[PDB]
Amino acid sequence: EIPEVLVDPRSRRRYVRGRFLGKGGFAKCFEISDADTKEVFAGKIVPKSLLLKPHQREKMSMEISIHRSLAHQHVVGFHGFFEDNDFVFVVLELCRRRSLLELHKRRKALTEPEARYYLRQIVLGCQYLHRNRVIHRDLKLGNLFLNEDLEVKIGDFGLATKVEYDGERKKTLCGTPNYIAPEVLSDAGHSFEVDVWSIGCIMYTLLVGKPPFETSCLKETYLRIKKNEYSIPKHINPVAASLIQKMLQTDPTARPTINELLNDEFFTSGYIPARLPITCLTIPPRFS
């Protein structure tokens, strides 16, 4: 059973469980508000019984360690964590318009300026992480959250890692990323370049309204990733289709860096809206 009111022995601050938001994988997530301040946050409550298997205790510890060290306006605000004997409580920024998964599911393909709007904010968030020697390793629609004003906030640092030294490549992952990069598939070792691959996969989905490689069965899906088999519809704009091709390459070193990515003709020469209307979640907007 989960307590109605969540108490923090450390800072003597206490919260009240609100509406059920859903299961964040291994977690049970609710709206919460501080007893005194009345400020609303997104609680992430993990059974400590599931954090008994060390392999899972490791993941949880690293997630909080990387996320609590990060403050950027396109990264989910980490507002603290604490635990009792039964649960671990993680207090995060509440993003009132959920994630790009919900948008994608409602809207399918977006307009090119909408695609561009969200993608710049994602790249900006990701450029901050990379600069702070952090690889997310699991960027997907589901963990790219939208605040009230449809500002993109990168969250879910479950599979994220910290690069210790210049040149480091990683092998081991405490979980299976949504978008498997070729160098993760082949277990070749990987670095920052995995994040560019997923942004390429994310860019494709936003413009095409379907994932690039995903098929009925996983065996064909992974074979397509291995041989770099995908088709960009003839209806996609050249410049954008070019930037997708640049990102979705078998060779990690061949892909743009997050810094080069942001300076693509797609971003520099294309129209970026300053603000999107809230109708964009359900109906395609007019720009012209």
Place this chain on the structure above:
Amino acid sequence: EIPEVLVDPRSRRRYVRGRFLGKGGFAKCFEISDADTKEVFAGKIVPKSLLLKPHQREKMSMEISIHRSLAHQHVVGFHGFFEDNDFVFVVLELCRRRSLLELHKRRKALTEPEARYYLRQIVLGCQYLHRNRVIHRDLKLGNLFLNEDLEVKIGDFGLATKVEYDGERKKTLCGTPNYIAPEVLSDAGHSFEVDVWSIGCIMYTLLVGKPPFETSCLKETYLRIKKNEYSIPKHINPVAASLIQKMLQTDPTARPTINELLNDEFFTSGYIPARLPITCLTIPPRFSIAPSSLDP
């Protein structure tokens, strides 16, 4: 010197040596493909000079005799054997994802459903053997092979024996099993129950990411087996830990039969994936704690 093309005087069928797979104990193993069919197999090429010591000639002959009599979808396909003056050539099913040893070495401990996934297939393979009065006597990660689709195929029948009548107990082994059962250690005589012991040792390793009894030196390892000294981490699920305790008992008669084993709450009440993704060989997959079969 090993011939580039392997010729069979009997059936006039001929093969071409492919990539080197590795040394299968006493053997030298390669990919091979038939000249006409172009079908790819796993060759096992034994120097006949090593099959000169009778004790070794006996093993080899019995291995081929037991294995060539067996056909099951969780047993390595035996596709024939032949010899020249220098070598004995054994043609087996090619399992393109090697063995559980490679998985274990990469992944260490697996998720409980992964453990369950492989274990059901192992028990099924072993239930077929037992039904055909065959004790494997050397089940280990290294000889539990994985085909393209991650189906488990039991191979390596080097220490395997044929039970002549029901109730018969055996003593002599022309080799040392990876997982020594207590009744083999004490030379008390043994039967089908040894195979359950190794599955218990295999189950433990898959869930814990380390062997139950193995230590630095062998003297302590064998003393632990003799006294039944092992510890199940507090993090293992009760039902699974219970089934391990049932299998890893000093008394062979106390252990489940391969038929009772398959019907354990671990298997019947636990979630079994129908298929694993190929990423499972390198990265742990995520499973819902509520995995119902009433949604996509």
